[PDB]
């Protein structure tokens, strides 16, 4: 008789309020370390606000099931799309300092 | 009777029926707070977009992100039209930051009534157009 | 009759009626383990009693020391011995123990210092038997008392297997035999007959306002019982007897609380004196309602109007603390700014005395049950129950007292329950009806569904109101009410002529409007004979030509070595009207009021006296 | 004479194959209340007896009239007409329902929803009542202020776009306001179980804090408010 609806909820604020903590943090303190959280944060919040729109519009048995997979997919797929630059490339960071001043 | 069994029947009756959904969207009032709560999920998913599309073509796509934007420079687009794409980005992001915040701050239960909607609506509104020429122009 | 599906509901018992009485009755007697169904034109809560305002009373003794027993004296005085003791013995004593059920239901009453329920005072109260002063025992929820009582008893209707009939237009009571089988009844949904039967059943239908032209009771108060009733050759009572309320606003009739001058409100005429000092010395513009809007009218009469067109009065509000208006009054506050655009901080409402309350309804005993009258004697309908403002136990007599409604709803619609259940048990044999029964029922329906005459039913509605209203108002003479007779009995002459133009089977409003046209006329028709007999000026019926209280005795000396008068030779005494629903005719008898209490040694009988505030 | 137009959204279901169109009334305003309830009982008497809406009180505080006039939903009773005869009224059903005849909603599902939330006091030892007044402070009383005054006209829930879209699951403000009423009645013993029956992503979790609803309500009453108020109790209320 666990209660996840509010649990979940909190997490989202919680996360919200990281995410925006973490943009200034990120102008500021421009690094590897804050790529990689700047990675997580994002696609989490992505990742659970889509899932609201879903929830949302969705109307369907197979379909919430669908949906809810294909958008699973959609951000492991972004988390290590993003990893993968932070690793292999310049990074969210640099890569930002680097379009901006073009 | 119980109240589920009421709504049961409820789905059974109408559903089987000829009767017609009053319109909404249609014909509803517009306001300010209404277009606000558009926009951000508008600006939200249109956010989420740019970011997975960064993250799968940095997956699927070949050549560095150095090797991208020489590919920009190519195609050498004015000064302006540079700032243009430069807006266009930062735009959506703080129109959905300043109003996220908005968001965050009705979810302590401050601030949630009629004219301090239409109030903080506006700050909201004036703090994007600020911050959304600021940061292209720097 | 092949044009109408006729479906057949069985039950243990029938309330017809989802106000606060209605609402009462009906889970009292789920609760009993009854198998009960409850039939309503509305939804529960959009039934009047929401727009109750005042409060609900009971001597629970909160503000000072009180006894229920002074609430009884109280009840009676106001009633001008009309008023029959047994019940309002019965009524008061329930009284604070009722009361008391409503807050542990989860009633928001207003709280004191003490955290107990706040009481106010009302017009017509007193403690220490009437030598005591104002009294303090109006319970209520601020000013949406009503409102707040309607919502937690159907909060609570909810906690039991009661089936619930949700807009259902009752048409006729299920007879057989003198004893009543239940309910045939329409489906606004969708067109279709119903016919509920069962065991017991009962009438908790409210008022009749709408016979007039300006009333604060909603639109749908048009006594719709009280005709069925009629329908079945059964009689109504002291259907004369209509409370003009002192304080309704002077645009749409709505109702201005009572509680407003109990709370320190002042009635003012055109040359700004306080005119209730004037008429009541003692108890001030905190008198009963029938001298209260007599004196108001009157005051209209001598030229000292208030309008542009002098036609009213002010209730002024302005010298009371802004904070006692916001926390005390606050729903009058609102309905005052957006019907007359009046600051009631600022400036006094425009109020005139408009029809409210019918104390007059179903004759019944003090346990609820519907009597007849058989060879000038009493006799109990079987499976027959009426309760609220419908009926008529004369809880109220010629005069209701304020705040005593919401009571009479809570304890008799109880009473009904335990008449009920502890008279028949669940589960007993429901008598078995007719194959055709309530067939006339249908075939009226059907009448008026495809009514193509020459007037149309709004028109003759119309005609009805205004008539009733310059004809049976506040004052009425002889010649004037043998007028306003000879015109009713022409309108109902007239109802074999109007036009309906909805042919539709489901929600047919049109349709549904012209049953009630019908349920006004029986009504109306009733209230203006009764009152033409009525030879005597008692409460709320004020004849210019009989200012007399004719009683027994002439109880204004003393009563020692006097000729009591024969019974048809005073008017101490109910009326009682009947209506060949054909010729329109009415007839009437007179049965005695009860004087008699419950206990004369635990509550001692009130004899008449010389009645003024 | 002042002439006012009114467009007026209609339907007949014992009619074959009718379609829903508007109807437009033209009233003279001195011969006429002020209100559009006035209106609509006039164009009923007068012109048109095929004209079917709910009504009782004219006072606004039944609810029954409750419907969608010139954009947003309201009491006809307590709206008053434009005087401004160039402007027409256009009166719709409350947004979203399913329509039975004309202005006539279905309102089954939302007093269902009402009755899924137990709107009654409730004891843990419901064996000592009708006998003793319940203490409550004034203070604590002053606590449901703002929430009893809700007259059930179902105006705010149906101008509620997720309640649009997903009616079926979600309670909307109406209903919710209600479950915060008895959450916070000092007098109440189940606060936790009644905020663990909303432990779904539908119930409460279905507002986004468009806050329509609080700006549509006709009693001046805050819906919006008391939700993000139970989402706080929702996420802190222990064990
Ligand atoms: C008019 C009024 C009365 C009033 C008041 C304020 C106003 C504006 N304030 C009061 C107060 O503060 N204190 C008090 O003691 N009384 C006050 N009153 C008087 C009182 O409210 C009424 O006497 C009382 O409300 C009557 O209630 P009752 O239980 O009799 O039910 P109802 O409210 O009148 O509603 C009638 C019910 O019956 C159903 N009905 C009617 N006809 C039919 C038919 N045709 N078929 C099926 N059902 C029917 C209605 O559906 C409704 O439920
Ligand atoms: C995943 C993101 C995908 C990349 C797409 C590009 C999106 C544009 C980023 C938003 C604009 C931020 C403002 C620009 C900025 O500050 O650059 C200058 C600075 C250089 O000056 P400097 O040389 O460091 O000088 C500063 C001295 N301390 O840049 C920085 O210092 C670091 C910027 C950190 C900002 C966080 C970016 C947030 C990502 C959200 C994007 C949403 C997708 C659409
Ligand atoms: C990094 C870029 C961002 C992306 C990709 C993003 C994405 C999203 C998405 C898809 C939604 C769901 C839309 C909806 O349900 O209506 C959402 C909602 C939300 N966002 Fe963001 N967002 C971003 C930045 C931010 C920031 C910086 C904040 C901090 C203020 C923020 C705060 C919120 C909040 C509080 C919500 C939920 C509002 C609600 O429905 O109650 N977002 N976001
Ligand atoms: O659909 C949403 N509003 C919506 C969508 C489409 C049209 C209208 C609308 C337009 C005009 C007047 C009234 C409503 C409103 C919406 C928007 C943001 C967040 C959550 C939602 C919702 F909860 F899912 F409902
Ligand atoms: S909160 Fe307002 S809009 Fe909602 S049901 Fe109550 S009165 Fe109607
Ligand atoms: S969809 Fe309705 S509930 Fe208020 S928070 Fe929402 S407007
Ligand atoms: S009809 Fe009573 S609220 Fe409009």
Redesign the pocket.
């Known amino acids: 008789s666990s209660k996840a609806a509010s649990l979940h909820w909190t997490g989202?604020?919680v996360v919200?309020?990281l995410?925006?903590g973490l943009?200034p943090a990120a102008y500021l303190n421009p690094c590897s370390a804050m790529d990689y959280s700047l990675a997580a944060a994002?696609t989490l919040?992505?990742h659970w606000?889509?899932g609201?729109?879903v929830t949302?519009y969705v109307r369907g048995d197979a379909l919430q099931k669908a949906a809810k997979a294909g958008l699973l997919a959609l951000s492991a797929f972004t988390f290590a799309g993003l990893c993968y630059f932070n690793y292999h490339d310049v990074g969210i960071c640099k890569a930002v300092a680097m379009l901006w001043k073009l | 009777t119980t109240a589920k069994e009421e709504m049961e029947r409820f789905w059974n009756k109408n559903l089987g029926s000829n009767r017609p959904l009053s319109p909404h969207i249609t014909i509803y009032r517009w306001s300010l707070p209404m277009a606000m709560s558009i926009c951000?999920?508008g600006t939200?998913?249109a956010?989420?977009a740019?970011?997975s599309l960064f993250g799968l073509s940095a997956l699927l796509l070949p050549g560095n992100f150095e090797s991208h934007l020489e590919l920009v420079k190519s195609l050498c687009l004015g000064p302006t039209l540079i700032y243009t794409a430069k807006f266009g980005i930062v735009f959506p992001?703080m129109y959905?930051?300043?109003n996220?915040?908005r968001?965050?701050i009705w979810?302590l239960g401050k601030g949630l009534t009629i004219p301090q909607l239409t109030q903080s609506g506006v700050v909201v509104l004036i703090l994007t157009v600020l911050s959304s020429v600021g940061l292209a122009a720097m | 009759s092949t044009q109408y599906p006729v479906v057949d509901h069985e039950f243990d018992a029938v309330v017809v009626g989802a106000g606060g009485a209605g609402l009462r009755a009906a889970f009292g007697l789920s609760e009993a383990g009854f198998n009960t169904a409850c039939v309503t034109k509305l939804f529960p809560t959009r039934s009047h009693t929401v727009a109750a305002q005042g409060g609900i009373n009971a001597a629970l003794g909160n503000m000072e020391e009180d006894n229920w027993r002074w609430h009884f004296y109280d009840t009676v005085k106001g009633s001008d011995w009309l008023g029959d003791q047994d019940a309002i013995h019965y009524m008061t004593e329930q009284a604070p123990a009722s009361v008391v059920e409503l807050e542990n239901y989860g009633m928001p009453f207003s709280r004191t210092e003490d955290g107990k329920i706040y009481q106010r005072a009302f017009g017509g109260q007193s403690l220490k038997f009437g030598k005591g002063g104002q009294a303090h025992r109006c319970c209520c929820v601020a000013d949406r008392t009503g409102h707040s009582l309607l919502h937690t008893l159907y909060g609570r209707s909810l906690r039991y297997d009661t089936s619930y009939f949700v807009e259902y237009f009752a048409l006729d009571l299920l007879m057989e035999n003198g004893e009543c089988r239940g309910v045939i009844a329409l489906c606004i949904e969708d067109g279709s007959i119903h016919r509920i039967r069962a065991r017991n059943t009962v009438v908790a239908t409210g008022g009749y306002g709408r016979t007039y032209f300006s009333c604060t009771s909603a639109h749908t108060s048009t006594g719709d019982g009280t005709a069925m009733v009629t329908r079945a050759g059964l009689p109504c009572q002291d259907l004369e007897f209509v409370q003009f309320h002192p304080t309704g606003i002077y645009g749409a009739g709505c109702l201005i609380t009572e509680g407003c001058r109990g709370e320190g409100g002042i009635l003012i005429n055109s040359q700004g004196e306080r005119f209730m000092e004037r008429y009541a010395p003692v108890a001030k513009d905190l008198a009963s309602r029938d001298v209260v809007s007599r004196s108001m009218t009157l005051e209209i009469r001598e030229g000292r109007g208030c309008g542009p067109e002098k036609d009213h009065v002010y209730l002024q509000l302005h010298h009371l603390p802004p904070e006692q208006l916001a926390v005390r009054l606050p729903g009058i506050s609102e309905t005052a700014m957006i019907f007359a655009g009046v600051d009631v901080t600022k400036e006094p409402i425009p109020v005139l005395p408009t029809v409210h309350y019918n104390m007059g309804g179903i004759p019944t005993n003090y346990k609820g049950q519907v009597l007849r009258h058989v060879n000038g004697q009493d006799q109990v309908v079987p499976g027959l129950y009426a309760c609220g403002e419908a009926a008529c136990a004369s809880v109220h007599g010629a005069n209701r007292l304020g705040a005593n409604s919401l009571l009479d709803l809570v304890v008799f619609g109880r009473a009904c329950a335990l008449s009920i259940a502890e008279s028949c048990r669940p589960g007993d044999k429901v008598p078995s009806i007719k194959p055709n029964a309530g067939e006339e029922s249908v075939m009226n329906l059907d009448k008026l569904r495809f009514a193509n005459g020459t007037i149309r039913t709004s028109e003759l509605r119309l005609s009805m109101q205004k008539s009733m209203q310059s004809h049976a108002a506040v004052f009425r003479v002889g010649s004037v009410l043998q007028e306003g007779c000879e015109k009713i009995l022409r309108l109902y002459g007239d109802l074999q002529h109007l036009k309906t133009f909805d042919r539709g089977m489901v929600w047919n409003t049109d349709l549904v409007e012209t049953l009630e046209l019908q349920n006004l006329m029986l009504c109306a028709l009733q209230t203006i004979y009764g009152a033409e007999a009525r030879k005597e000026s008692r409460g709320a019926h004020a004849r210019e030509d009989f200012k007399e209280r004719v009683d027994e005795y002439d109880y204004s000396k003393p009563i020692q070595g006097q000729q009591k008068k024969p019974f048809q030779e005073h008017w101490r005494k109910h009326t009682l009207s009947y209506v060949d629903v054909k010729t329109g005719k009415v007839s009437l008898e007179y049965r005695p009021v009860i004087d008699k209490t419950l206990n004369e040694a635990d509550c001692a009988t009130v004899p008449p006296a010389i009645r003024s505030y | 004479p002042r002439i006012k137009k009114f467009a007026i959204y209609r339907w007949d279901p014992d009619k074959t194959g009718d379609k829903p169109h508007m109807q437009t009334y033209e009233i003279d305003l001195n011969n006429c209340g002020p209100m559009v309830l006035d209106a609509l009982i006039k164009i009923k008497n007068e012109i048109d007896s095929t004209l079917t809406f709910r009504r009782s009180c004219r006072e606004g505080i039944c609810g029954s009239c409750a419907m969608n006039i010139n954009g947003g939903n309201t009491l006809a009773c307590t709206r008053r007409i434009d005087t401004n005869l160039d402007k027409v009224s256009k009166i719709y059903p409350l947004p979203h329902m399913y329509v039975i005849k004309d202005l006539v909603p279905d309102l089954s599902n939302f007093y269902a929803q009402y009755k899924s939330i137990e709107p009654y006091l409730k004891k843990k030892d419901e064996s000592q009542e009708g006998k003793q007044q319940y203490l409550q402070s004034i203070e604590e009383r002053e606590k449901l202020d703002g929430l009893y005054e809700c007259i059930l006209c179902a105006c705010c829930s149906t101008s509620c776009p997720s309640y649009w879209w997903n009616g079926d699951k979600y309670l909307g403000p109406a209903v919710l306001m209600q479950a915060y009423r008895w959450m916070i009645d000092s007098r109440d013993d189940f606060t936790e179980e009644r905020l663990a029956k909303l432990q779904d992503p539908f119930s409460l979790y279905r507002c986004?804090?468009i806050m329509n609803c609080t700006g549509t309500c006709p009693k001046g009453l805050n819906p919006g408010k008391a939700i993000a108020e139970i989402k706080k109790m929702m996420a802190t209320y222990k064990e």
């Open positions: 989202e604020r919200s309020v995410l925006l943009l994002l919040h992505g606000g889509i609201q729109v949302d | 951000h999920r939200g998913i956010l989420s740019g970011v992001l959905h930051t300043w996220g915040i968001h965050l979810d | 986004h804090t």
